[PDB]
Amino acid sequence: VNFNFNGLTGTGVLTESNKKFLPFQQFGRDIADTTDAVRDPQTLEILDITPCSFGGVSVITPGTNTSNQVAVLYQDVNCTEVNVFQTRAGCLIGAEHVNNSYECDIPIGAGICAVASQSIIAYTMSLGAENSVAYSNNSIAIPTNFTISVTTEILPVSMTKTSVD
Amino acid sequence: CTMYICGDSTECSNLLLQYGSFCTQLNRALTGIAVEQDKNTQEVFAQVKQIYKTPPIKDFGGFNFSQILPDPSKPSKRSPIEDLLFNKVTLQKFNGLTVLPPLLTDEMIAQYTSALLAGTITSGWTFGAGPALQIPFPMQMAYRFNGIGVTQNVLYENQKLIANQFNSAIGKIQDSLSSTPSALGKLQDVVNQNAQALNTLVKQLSSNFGAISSVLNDILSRLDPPEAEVQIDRLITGRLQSLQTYVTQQLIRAAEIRASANLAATKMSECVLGQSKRVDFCGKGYHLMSFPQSAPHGVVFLHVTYVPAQEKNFTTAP
Amino acid sequence: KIQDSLSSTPSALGKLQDVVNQNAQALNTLVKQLSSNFGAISSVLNDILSRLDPPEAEVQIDRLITGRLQSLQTYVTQQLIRAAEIRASANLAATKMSECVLGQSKRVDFCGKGYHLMSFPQSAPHGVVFLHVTYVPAQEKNFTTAPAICHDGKAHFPREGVFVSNGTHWFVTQRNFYEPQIITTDNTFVSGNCDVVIGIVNNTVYDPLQPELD
Amino acid sequence: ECVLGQSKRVDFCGKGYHLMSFPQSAPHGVVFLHVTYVPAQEKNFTTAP
Amino acid sequence: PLSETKCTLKSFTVEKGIYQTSNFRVQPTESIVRFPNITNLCPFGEVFNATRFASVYAWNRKRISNCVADYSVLYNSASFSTFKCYGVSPTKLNDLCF
């Protein structure tokens, strides 16, 4: 609601609070001088003002060059405030959570990554192909053949020599 | 911007639009350092693609590794030393100034650490080069002596003593960490200064910057626009200047963190994935090998260094 | 395969395209700031000079000058931070050149994954591309091993390499390429007796002098 | 890597093969003297694998 | 959301990835104002229409508290030739509480 408490305008939600005001003070303040609790006229009850539950909105998109399917992530918000998958970062809608694990394609948050098979999937990252090693106290592994690989390592050295007057 | 400078108000949001691409610029810089954090973590930990697993039996010729391998009885699958580190470091969120969670959760970060420990223990250094090649630990450590000009026979004829000394030193690591405050001083300093910068940024809203009130709500409620413009413009100018200062200092601090993370990755690559010859880079004294250990927003190494003891004089000739 | 991957795979030169795009986009934003009026009646100086006499055009041109000056300050600061990052990257590139191209570096995975053999530089637009010719084992075989060989009480350790067996006979071989050799006194050295070292095997170690002796 | 010990990473402790180094205090700085081994007076030879 | 991403990135081709766009803030559904039970009218008539005005040497000061005040009548009344307000806008001066 958009409330006006004796000229103390604001917007948010009024809840019950265990903040036991002493009988003299009217309204409490958080850091940066914002109104957080108030006692209203005609009832004197200690209402707690909290701004309406905010949350950033992010978009997983595989690229308009490939598809128009869009996945929407409402971070740090439980799925009770409007498939739909809950994450440690927030609830991501528009993707189907799966059980198999693949390498990360689009980062999502807290070990979760996202088009595949005509749909958007959201899954726990595959940390890599698990591979135990047959250790013992007397076993040795020695290669019999090798291979020579060439890897391209790319490093910037300079930028455009800009200048502004 | 909208939440920070203005919060729920189109009146100053319109005026903020007059300042051009400042907002997309700041948000882009913050997103860049944010993704750079995940880049740092992945580049410093995910040095091996395949997750290794320690053997079910800990028959390592006498080296009691139970202090650094993850403990199944622990609910979070963390070794005692990493648990102590997490318990040793102690860790703004209301005005649009939010915190995104790290990509690599602590569980999977610990999984990389356990994989690296298992790889080092089981295959020495070859798992960082190519395929993992299992090596019994007495021979692997005999080679690591052989890499600092100490022949194998020293190890083999002193195996029990070297194992006991290594176990005792690992235990003393726990004792030192637990009894010594600020053993995690670097991580505590970085976390504390980041949180303090955030607190100062929040506190800046308690400043008038020349306006007649530090909260734009009441000046909006009590000022006619065609003169409230100058007040709200002063307030926006000051608040945006504060945001620029915060973002710039964050950029510099993130550059320092990037340098430290690159150094950490190089150290893990050269001391963990292999034996490093460059002296005083993998711990004081001659170096053998090291163990990574996950720490909150950081990494902790255990440089296993060989150091000569009581020495005898001799009359010599070249 | 290098040329095939470079030609086929897009964003292979992403490490350079990103810095080029960042510089160009920062410049574009810097230009676009001119379009914003920073709170004054116009974002073009010629209009305010044209339709406002100086005594009250001072305030408008002052708003423009201060806002645009702050924008230029921000741009220069961003460029300075990015130049510091590029400076660090360039020092890393120079170190990599001097340690991988000009010579062979034993620093693991500093000149490409695996054991490093040599490197080839290649000029790139505002960058350098390294070709790290590295050596990587492929196929490995298990063997039964032993940290020592006990012969007539004396211990014997490998002078260089390890002891391995295929299950029936022992051999000395180097530690990165299976190349078994019969155990002789030339590639092994003696140290003490064989009752202090654990987990060792009784065996014979050949003496090259004896076959010519007899 | 140069004073407290001998390095092998080329062109990190001065031009040429590195022998050792000496630090020297300087106003708001340091000056190393990298003493390095540089060959010369080469001769051509016929060589075989 | 796809169009919003296109809008923010100021382009059509969006690269494959995650992009932060805005903040989800459910708008208020209705507006409420809470004011006390006070009903008395402070003697603004007796101040703006005082029998005798004190000189500046002994300017008369009258406390006003614990009532509801109608600045609307005095503002609309053009009897006041000059009505200059600093720090508060005279139009919504009736809105606030003091």
Short mmCIF file of C-alpha atoms in Angstrom, two decimals, chain B residues 265-278 281-282 287 290, chain C residues 99 105-110, chain D residues 1 9:
data_model
loop_
_atom_site.label_atom_id
_atom_site.label_comp_id
_atom_site.label_asym_id
_atom_site.label_seq_id
_atom_site.Cartn_x
_atom_site.Cartn_y
_atom_site.Cartn_z
CA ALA B 265 45.95 -19.94 -9.41
CA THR B 266 49.61 -19.89 -10.42
CA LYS B 267 50.58 -21.10 -6.95
CA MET B 268 48.07 -23.96 -7.05
CA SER B 269 49.16 -24.89 -10.57
CA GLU B 270 52.87 -24.87 -9.71
CA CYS B 271 52.88 -26.19 -6.12
CA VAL B 272 49.84 -28.51 -6.10
CA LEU B 273 49.78 -29.85 -9.66
CA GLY B 274 53.55 -30.33 -9.52
CA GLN B 275 56.77 -29.63 -7.66
CA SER B 276 58.03 -26.08 -8.14
CA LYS B 277 61.74 -25.27 -8.19
CA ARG B 278 61.47 -21.49 -7.80
CA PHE B 281 57.32 -19.44 -3.95
CA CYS B 282 55.73 -22.53 -2.39
CA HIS B 287 59.48 -27.28 -1.45
CA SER B 290 51.10 -28.59 -1.16
CA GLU C 99 60.05 -18.37 -20.56
CA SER C 105 60.13 -23.69 -18.77
CA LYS C 106 59.67 -26.47 -16.21
CA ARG C 107 56.83 -24.52 -14.57
CA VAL C 108 53.90 -26.91 -15.02
CA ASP C 109 50.88 -25.60 -17.01
CA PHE C 110 52.40 -22.16 -17.50
CA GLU D 1 64.09 -16.33 -6.95
CA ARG D 9 63.20 -19.06 -15.89
#
